[PDB]
């Protein structure tokens, strides 16, 4: 019964992801934001 809630939550999550009007992003850019995020996290220590 816990697998049915997980699958329903996941299908709804993907359905939301596929309804997003914003265009897909090159891996290039995600590497840049991840780098931006870890740097700001370390400056906060």
């Amino acid at each position: 019964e816990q697998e049915n809630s997980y699958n329903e939550w996941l299908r709804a999550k993907v359905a939301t992801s596929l309804a997003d009007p914003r265009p897909a992003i090159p891996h290039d850019e995600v590497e840049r934001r991840m780098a931006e995020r870890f740097a700001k996290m370390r400056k906060e220590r």
Partner: protein, 92 residues
């Protein structure tokens, strides 16, 4: 080589997952990102390497970590990372 792309939802998952871990371990958060990126980058050369998902038809499932899964699909022009999810929790 086929271009690897990310849905904003996938980027947001990435940000959410690594944010929660970093509140307790920044290096554990980076190691998880180094693993996820190392699963998605070679998709340019092996787009259909991972099996199709039975939970979400039309997507393919990478078990990058015992606790985290990458869901992607191959389009007419690219491979798109759709979401990055926890394998056992409804997260993020």
């Amino acid at each position: 080589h086929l271009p690897v792309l990310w849905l904003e939802s996938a980027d947001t998952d990435l940000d959410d997952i690594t944010s929660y871990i970093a509140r307790f371990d920044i290096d554990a958060a980076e190691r998880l990102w180094q693993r996820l990126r190392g699963c998605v980058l070679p998709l340019s050369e092996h787009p259909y390497l991972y099996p199709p998902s039975d939970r979400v038809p039309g997507l393919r499932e990478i078990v990058a970590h015992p606790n985290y899964i990458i869901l992607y699909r191959v389009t007419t022009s690219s491979v798109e990372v759709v979401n990055v999810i926890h394998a056992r929790r409804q997260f993020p």
